[PDB]
Write a protein that holds these residues in place. Structure first.
Motif, mmCIF file in Angstrom:
data_model
loop_
_atom_site.group_PDB
_atom_site.id
_atom_site.type_symbol
_atom_site.label_atom_id
_atom_site.label_comp_id
_atom_site.label_asym_id
_atom_site.label_seq_id
_atom_site.Cartn_x
_atom_site.Cartn_y
_atom_site.Cartn_z
ATOM 1 N N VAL B 403 0.863 -1.187 0.000
ATOM 2 C CA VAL B 403 0.000 0.000 0.000
ATOM 3 C C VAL B 403 0.907 1.247 0.000
ATOM 4 O O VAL B 403 1.792 1.356 0.849
ATOM 5 C CB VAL B 403 -0.979 -0.040 1.206
ATOM 6 N N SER B 404 0.708 2.161 -0.962
ATOM 7 C CA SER B 404 1.522 3.371 -1.064
ATOM 8 C C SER B 404 1.189 4.407 0.022
ATOM 9 O O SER B 404 0.008 4.678 0.283
ATOM 10 C CB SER B 404 1.433 3.984 -2.462
ATOM 11 N N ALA B 405 2.244 4.980 0.652
ATOM 12 C CA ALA B 405 2.121 6.006 1.688
ATOM 13 C C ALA B 405 1.948 7.391 1.048
ATOM 14 O O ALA B 405 2.346 7.589 -0.105
ATOM 15 C CB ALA B 405 3.348 5.985 2.582
ATOM 16 N N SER B 406 1.353 8.346 1.790
ATOM 17 C CA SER B 406 1.143 9.717 1.313
ATOM 18 C C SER B 406 2.489 10.397 0.952
ATOM 19 O O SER B 406 3.507 10.051 1.559
ATOM 20 C CB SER B 406 0.381 10.534 2.355
ATOM 21 N N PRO B 407 2.549 11.326 -0.038
ATOM 22 C CA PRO B 407 3.848 11.958 -0.365
ATOM 23 C C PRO B 407 4.304 12.964 0.705
ATOM 24 O O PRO B 407 5.302 12.729 1.398
ATOM 25 C CB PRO B 407 3.605 12.607 -1.744
ATOM 26 N N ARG B 417 4.378 6.770 6.119
ATOM 27 C CA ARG B 417 5.099 5.486 6.094
ATOM 28 C C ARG B 417 5.189 4.962 7.540
ATOM 29 O O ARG B 417 4.995 3.774 7.780
ATOM 30 C CB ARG B 417 6.503 5.666 5.474
ATOM 31 N N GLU B 418 5.383 5.893 8.497
ATOM 32 C CA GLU B 418 5.483 5.670 9.941
ATOM 33 C C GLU B 418 4.187 5.113 10.541
ATOM 34 O O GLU B 418 4.265 4.243 11.409
ATOM 35 C CB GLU B 418 5.919 6.958 10.670
ATOM 36 N N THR B 419 3.010 5.594 10.080
ATOM 37 C CA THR B 419 1.703 5.111 10.541
ATOM 38 C C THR B 419 1.462 3.673 10.054
ATOM 39 O O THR B 419 1.085 2.802 10.849
ATOM 40 C CB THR B 419 0.595 6.045 10.054
ATOM 41 N N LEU B 420 1.657 3.448 8.738
ATOM 42 C CA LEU B 420 1.485 2.154 8.090
ATOM 43 C C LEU B 420 2.420 1.089 8.701
ATOM 44 O O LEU B 420 1.976 -0.034 8.966
ATOM 45 C CB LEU B 420 1.726 2.287 6.575
ATOM 46 N N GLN B 421 3.700 1.463 8.944
ATOM 47 C CA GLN B 421 4.724 0.599 9.537
ATOM 48 C C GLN B 421 4.347 0.211 10.968
ATOM 49 O O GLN B 421 4.483 -0.958 11.331
ATOM 50 C CB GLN B 421 6.105 1.279 9.488
ATOM 51 N N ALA B 422 3.847 1.186 11.757
ATOM 52 C CA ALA B 422 3.380 0.985 13.128
ATOM 53 C C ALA B 422 2.249 -0.053 13.131
ATOM 54 O O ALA B 422 2.269 -0.989 13.933
ATOM 55 C CB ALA B 422 2.881 2.305 13.708
ATOM 56 N N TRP B 423 1.293 0.096 12.190
ATOM 57 C CA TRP B 423 0.157 -0.801 12.012
ATOM 58 C C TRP B 423 0.619 -2.219 11.641
ATOM 59 O O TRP B 423 0.229 -3.182 12.318
ATOM 60 C CB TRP B 423 -0.817 -0.234 10.966
ATOM 61 N N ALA B 424 1.497 -2.333 10.603
ATOM 62 C CA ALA B 424 2.061 -3.595 10.104
ATOM 63 C C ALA B 424 2.700 -4.362 11.231
ATOM 64 O O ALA B 424 2.349 -5.516 11.440
ATOM 65 C CB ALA B 424 3.082 -3.323 9.012
#
Ligand SMILES: C[S@@+](CC[C@H](N)C(=O)[O-])C[C@H]1O[C@@H](n2cnc3c(N)ncnc32)[C@H](O)[C@@H]1O
Ligand SMILES: [Zn+2]
Ligand SMILES: [Zn+2]
Ligand SMILES: [Zn+2]
Ligand SMILES: [Zn+2]
Ligand SMILES: [Zn+2]
Ligand SMILES: [Zn+2]
Ligand SMILES: [Zn+2]
Ligand SMILES: [Zn+2]
Lengths: 8, 481, 839
Positions: B403-407, B417-424
């Motif tokens: 899933v692509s992170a916001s620019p 990328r930090e939010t998605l990584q925390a979730w993962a």
């Protein structure tokens, strides 16, 4: 090396 | 509504005085709630220290300064035995609660808790007992794991009084002191583990409702493997037909599975068990599926690793899962560095679906996706942004920081990328050798090594016990005003 | 197509693997959640209800309350005093033990084992003497595994291999659909395996040939081989990244493929007319025991690499020497000088001159060949009747086919070996020992005896001809039953005892003595005629008190009837268990046999330091043969003799006995024993601390009721305390697990064809139960098998063929009589005569 009891 | 998603928070904590005063230290080794009380009854649990049995009743309170815990019974085993294993049972005749206690001497002591008397003693094991477990299928069946490297199966039934030992799991299956014994809900399968690093699954026969002159000896397990962990196994458990287990120096609780094993199939005989012919093979299984393009088909499969950090060289730490119909499954465990961990297994599935939808929307709308929480309709949210903007519903408990992170951070679409990584890190299950971060990680005051976990039948109370005769009570769905 | 482009495609096909895992895990997690167990055995009312807070000994409990997200303790350390209810125990634990102690009838063979864990003695303090004492002990246990010169795999790579194997298991299913998606010319699993064998090296060049014999070397065009060469390199770039833990080469995936793996097995068992027979009987001549007749037994050598060298015909030159001698014996007996159910010879010749006969296959002509060879130059026995019963074919077909192929034996040269003079110390004719015999030989001295294969040379039994019996040892040894030499030609051939008496004979103290007693051995049911061991040594006649009251007293271990005994708490201080007499034992009587696992001197030390303690000691190792280095470990398997304690002036005494090429430990009464008394023996000068390469080992010198006793007695299985006067428990030995162990061993053999395994597993299942040790009882037990399995044997083509191979080997060996072959003919045709009567 392994340990069963907690250190006080 | 969203109450099904809440996880425990620390409520009460008691420091019981030092009961083992010989210069080694007094610790609470086993916490167990009584499982035969009717629905709604205030939960009653037993706490085992090196020489005592503490019996408490928990009643939900409206005042945050009040103590829900009340010690209704306190027993002292007058001997030289340093206890650690415990399980609950019922009087086969009067149905009065019975508490089994075993230690370093090798005897199981059955206490009539309500009357403050000793019911009976289970003699036979030639070493100290480390774990006790009661058959979910039969409240009179008790499995004991001892330093004699064997498992004795006992029956508290009136037909099994003269000779209470109904079965022995021996042979050469184990070579050193056993640390964990677990039951399958069908009461026919037993898991055993210990110092020898071997995890064995045994199928028990049907025991006759008559006197047994000799116990049924079981020479081989139906599945045996030492390849799941590279260290001593101290806690093993069933989660459906799936296996959860932990080892020393590994920092994980491993969720794995026996390939071909299903408790929906017929229980195999004793002569179906695999015998160890080729010693250059550390795994053998009766269950192995026949269909495969590989001459050696995989006998087990590593599914997930629950990251339980800062344990180190510490062993004899046990996890406990809350698994009741209608409620969420919660895995709880306390580490050797003062922290209690929680995982809501209902969260993985929701995250998986959330991410799958998000991925699909990102592709279909070229990243122009807006995510709205549950608490507004999809067809309602879609009208606000119109067509050409994708809308994905996100579970309320998912909080920010393939899933692509916001620019840039001011972008109307996507998470950092930090939010998605925390979730993962907490809910991703794509890596069998990955480390799942605890969904709730609650710290503890002062030096604390977790020993055993216990959930109340309705999952409103979670008791964790450990070093210096301590017990930490965690609550959910509180009545506090 | 190029390596860099292929590796790109694999990388995208690889992202399937983690999205597939996620789907699976989540699926199983939802499935187990749905199937959550509903609580059972709930009491109709709350049983705890009546109880109230307990706030004589008293103990402290300090409570504390918490609130908020971080769980901040709202400081209220309120302690209440609680009354303690002291519950002292009425029951005492049993004396300690390790492992489930199982009963074995006879000694079982064991595999040499390795340490695959870390033995935890207790908690060691960081940087202390206790830590240094424990860590140096584990390094010394690593040195025992390395001493064997074995596969010393460090834990650093054990963990790494484990991890790699797990990843190989993961990717293996993906290979075929990925290859199938890429559709590259010359990129097929078979071709990739073809490339694997060809391009090096982790395979034996011999194994390389086998893989290239199954598959071909053919993988052309030269561009198609470029493609296969490119894919292997491309795959290794993606999945065999040397910097990673989850690493796996394509070679490793192909190595576990079903058509590849059976080439790298390492679990292997094994005149033009004669050559064919040799190959056909192979399995029987290689695995078939000469002692117990089983193809998986407790006889034979376990080499350092855990591979078994059975006590079979291959140990004594295979089929050819044993058979050539049979033919020679047959042509010599010829100088001095029956009807069946389905036709014969005296009634029908070759049948009808012009009768339609179905064509015989290669397997049928084979059965005619090997049976004619093993029966050979016989007088009475004729193959046709038996081959007829085996093939199902009418008896006249085997006459017609025998004339058709014109079967002619190899001839046997006149083996009239010249006369040798009798030994100065042993008369084989008068059956006795004279002169300095005890100094002359070492037959009787088992402690200094080294095992060797029985002599199979064709010449005389001397040092010049190279007979091992006479030359291999420090002194010569009497030639035993398995030596190919005969009593009339070889002066070393043991011929039995000349013993006979109306009363008891073959006794420890006697006009003329018993050679068997003097040679520290039991009597041979065959060779020791009129003594009369043939009847007494039979375990079926074991409880016949009027038979054993006279005759052969030297077959104690063979009868296998031990005096009644009880398990109890030893009279000695902190000794645990002790064996107690349940009956009255008079002096010179056999009490019990010491049984356990047959292990090397090496395996014994390995176990001792594995199980043992440095902060300390219990040992069940008993030396059987000090020189050869065979020991008996009764730690898990054995009998009640494992519990007998030490005392210099004991009441019993151990003795190593030669029991039909089986070394066994017997205990005999050296005093008068009354019931309830504790049994003791002097352990020897190899066991250390005993008070009323280095391994603590015991050695030897070189119907009923619970008895009245002061000490508590326990049941060996249940561990329940037996009370005096109650019937003394006598639990029958359960062998099922041991039979299972043996069935599976055979099943695990690669070079055994399914058809072979089926008969071998059935014969062994049957025969391992009878514990045969003398050929004297094989005919009896053979007829029971051919009778009990009669219907099973006729029902399949393979079963008859396999059964005949077994019968051939036993005939060639002159171990199975002629009369037993024709009786077996009659039971098989009668079994087939009932198959058509209802089928
Ligand atoms: C072959 S086992 C005998 C059974 C053993 N007593 C039990 O409880 O299982 C021998 C062990 O018994 C003990 N033992 C026997 N006789 C002894 C004696 N006289 N003094 C001290 N220890 C003795 C030692 O620990 C020795 O290793
Ligand atoms: Zn044998
Ligand atoms: Zn005939
Ligand atoms: Zn010879
Ligand atoms: Zn010889
Ligand atoms: Zn000879
Ligand atoms: Zn004699
Ligand atoms: Zn004799
Ligand atoms: Zn005799």
């Amino acid at each position: 090396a392994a340990r069963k009891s907690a250190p006080a | 509504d969203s109450a099904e998603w809440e996880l425990p928070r620390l409520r009460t904590s008691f420091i019981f005085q030092d009961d083992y005063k010989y210069l080694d230290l007094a610790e609470f080794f086993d916490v167990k709630f009584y499982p035969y009380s009717p629905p709604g009854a205030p939960p009653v649990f037993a706490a085992t220290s090196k020489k005592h049995a503490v019996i408490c009743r928990l009643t939900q309170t409206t005042d945050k300064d009040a103590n829900p815990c009340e010690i209704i019974q306190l027993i002292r085993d007058d001997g030289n035995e340093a206890n650690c294993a415990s399980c609950w049972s019922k009087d086969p005749i009067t149905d009065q609660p019975l508490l089994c206690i075993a230690g370093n001497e090798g005897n199981v002591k059955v206490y009539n808790v309500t009357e403050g008397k000793l019911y009976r003693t289970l003699v036979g094991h030639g070493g100290g007992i480390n774990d006790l477990a009661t058959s979910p299928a039969n409240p009179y069946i008790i499995a004991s794991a001892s330093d004699d490297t064997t498992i004795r199966i006992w029956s508290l039934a009136p037909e099994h009084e003269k000779q209470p030992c109904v079965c022995i799991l021996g042979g050469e299956g184990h070579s050193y002191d056993l640390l964990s014994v677990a039951f399958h809900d069908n009461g026919r399968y037993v898991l055993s583990a210990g110092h020898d690093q071997v995890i064995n699954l045994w199928a028990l026969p049907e025991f006759p409702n008559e006197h047994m002159e000799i116990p049924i000896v079981i020479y081989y397990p139906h599945f045996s493997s030492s390849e799941i962990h590279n260290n001593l196994v101290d806690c093993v458990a069933f989660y459906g037909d799936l296996i959860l287990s932990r080892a020393c120096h590994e920092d994980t609780i491993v969720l794995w599975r026996i390939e071909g094993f299903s408790s929906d199939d017929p229980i195999p005989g004793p002569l179906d068990a695999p015998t160890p012919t080729d010693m250059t093979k550390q795994t053998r299984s009766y269950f192995t599926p026949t269909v495969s393009p590989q001459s050696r088909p995989a006998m087990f499969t590593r599914l997930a690793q629950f990251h339980t950090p800062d344990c180190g060289v510490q062993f004899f730490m046990r996890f406990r899962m809350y698994h009741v119909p209608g409620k969420h499954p919660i895995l709880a465990f306390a580490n050797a560095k003062s922290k209690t961990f929680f995982w809501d297994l209902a969260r993985f599935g929701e995250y998986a679906r959330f991410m799958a939808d998000l991925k699909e929307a990102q592709q279909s709308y070229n990243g122009r996706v807006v995510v709205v929480d549950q608490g507004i309709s999809l067809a309602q949210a879609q009208q606000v942004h119109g067509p050409g903007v994708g809308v994905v519903m996100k579970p309320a408990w998912l909080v920010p920081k393939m899933v692509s992170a916001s620019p840039d951070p001011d972008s109307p679409f996507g998470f950092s990328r930090e939010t998605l990584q925390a979730w993962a890190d907490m809910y991703d299950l794509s890596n069998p050798v990955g480390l799942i971060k605890a969904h709730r990680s609650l710290a503890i005051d002062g030096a604390f090594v977790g020993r055993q976990v216990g959930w109340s039948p309705e999952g409103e109370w979670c008791v964790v016990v450990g070093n210096g005769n301590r017990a930490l009570i965690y609550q959910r769905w509180g009545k506090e005003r | 197509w190029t390596v860099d482009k292929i590796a790109s495609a694999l990388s995208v096909l690889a992202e399937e693997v983690p999205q597939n895992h996620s789907r699976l895990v989540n699926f199983l997690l939802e499935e187990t959640e749905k199937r959550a167990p509903q609580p059972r055995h709930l009491s109709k009312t709350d049983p705890f209800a009546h109880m109230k807070s307990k706030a004589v000994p008293t103990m402290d409990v300090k409570f504390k309350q918490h609130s908020g997200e971080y769980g901040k303790s709202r400081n209220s350390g309120r302690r209440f005093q609680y009354p303690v209810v002291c519950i002292k125990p009425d029951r005492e634990p049993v004396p300690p033990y390790r492992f489930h102690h199982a009963e074995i009838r006879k000694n079982i063979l064991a595999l040499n084992s390795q340490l695959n864990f870390v033995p935890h003695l207790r908690d060691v303090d960081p940087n202390s003497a206790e830590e240094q004492k424990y860590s140096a002990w584990l390094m010394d246990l690593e040195n025992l595994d390395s001493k064997s010169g074995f596969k010393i795999q460090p834990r650093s790579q054990k963990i790494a291999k484990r991890a790699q194997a797990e990843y190989a298991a993961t990717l293996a299913p993906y290979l075929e659909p990925w290859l199938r998606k890429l559709n590259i010319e010359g990129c097929t699993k078979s071709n990739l395996i073809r490339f694997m064998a060809s391009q090096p090296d982790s395979m034996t060049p011999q194994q390389k040939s086998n893989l290239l014999d199954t598959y071909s070397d053919d993988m052309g065009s030269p561009q198609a081989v470029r493609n296969a060469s490119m894919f292997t390199e491309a795959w290794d770039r993606v999945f065999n990244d040397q910097s990673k833990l989850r690493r796996v080469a394509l070679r490793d995936i192909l190595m576990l493929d079903k058509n590849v793996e059976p080439i790298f097995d390492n679990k292997r068992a094994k005149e033009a007319l004669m050559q064919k027979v040799i190959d056909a009987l192979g399995s029987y001549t290689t695995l078939g025991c000469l002692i117990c007749f089983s193809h998986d037994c407790e006889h034979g050598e376990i080499e350092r690499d855990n591979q078994k060298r059975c006590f079979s015909l291959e140990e004594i030159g295979g089929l050819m020497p044993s058979l050539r001698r049979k033919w020679a014996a047959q042509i010599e007996q010829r100088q001095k000088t029956p009807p069946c159910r389905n036709e014969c010879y005296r009634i029908h010749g070759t049948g009808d001159p012009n009768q339609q006969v179905p064509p015989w296959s290669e397997n049928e002509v084979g059965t005619l060949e090997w049976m004619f060879a093993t029966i050979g130059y016989s007088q009475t026995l004729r193959p046709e009747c038996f081959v007829g019963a085996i093939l199902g074919r009418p008896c006249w077909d085997v006459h017609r086919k025998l004339q058709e192929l014109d079967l002619r034996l190899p001839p046997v040269e006149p083996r009239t070996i010249p006369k040798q003079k009798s030994l100065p110390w042993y008369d084989r004719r008068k059956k006795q020992l004279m002169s300095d015999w005890a100094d002359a030989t070492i037959t009787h001295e088992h402690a200094v005896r080294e095992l060797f294969a029985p002599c199979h040379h064709d010449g005389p039994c001397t040092a010049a001809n190279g007979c091992p019996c006479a030359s291999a040892g420090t002194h010569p040894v009497l030639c035993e039953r398995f030596c190919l030499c005969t009593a009339e030609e070889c002066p070393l051939k043991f011929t039995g005892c000349a013993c006979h008496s109306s009363g008891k004979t073959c006794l420890q103290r006697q006009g003329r003595p018993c050679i068997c007693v003097q040679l520290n051995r039991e009597c041979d049911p065959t060779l020791c005629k009129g003594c009369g061991a043939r009847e007494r040594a039979d375990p079926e006649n074991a409880y016949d008190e009027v038979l054993h009251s006279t005759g052969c007293q030297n077959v104690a271990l063979q009868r296998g009837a031990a005096k009644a005994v009880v398990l109890g708490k030893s009279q000695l201080e902190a000794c645990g268990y002790g064996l107690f007499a349940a009956e009255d034992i008079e002096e010179g009587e056999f009490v019990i046999e010491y049984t356990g696992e047959l292990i090397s001197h090496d395996e014994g030390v390995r176990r001792e330091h594995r199980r043992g303690d440095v902060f300390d000691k219990v040992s069940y190792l008993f030396t059987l043969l000090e020189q050869e280095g065979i020991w008996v470990d009764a730690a898990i398997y054995g009998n009640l003799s494992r519990y007998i304690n030490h005392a210099t002036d004991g009441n019993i005494m151990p003795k190593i006995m030669y029991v039909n090429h089986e070394w066994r430990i017997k205990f005999t009464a050296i005093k008068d024993i009354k019931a309830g008394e504790e049994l003791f023996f002097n352990y020897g000068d190899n066991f250390p601390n005993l008070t009323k390469t280095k391994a603590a080992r015991m050695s030897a010198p070189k119907p009923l009721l619970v008895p009245k006793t002061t000490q508590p007695l326990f049941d060996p299985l249940s561990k329940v305390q037996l009370l005096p006067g109650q019937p003394l428990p006598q639990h029958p030995i359960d062998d099922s697990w041991l039979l299972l162990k043996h069935r599976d061993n055979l099943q695990d053999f690669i070079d055994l064809r399914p058809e072979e395994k089926e008969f071998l597993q059935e014969w062994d299942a049957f025969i391992l139960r009878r514990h045969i040790s003398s050929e004297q009882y094989l005919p009896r037990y053979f007829l029971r098998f051919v009778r009990e399995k009669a219907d099973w044997l006729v029902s399949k083509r393979s079963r008859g063929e396999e059964f005949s191979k077994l019968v051939a080997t036993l005939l060639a060996r002159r171990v199975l009589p002629e009369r037993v072959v024709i009786e077996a003919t009659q039971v098989l045709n009668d079994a087939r005569g009932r198959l058509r009567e209802q089928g």
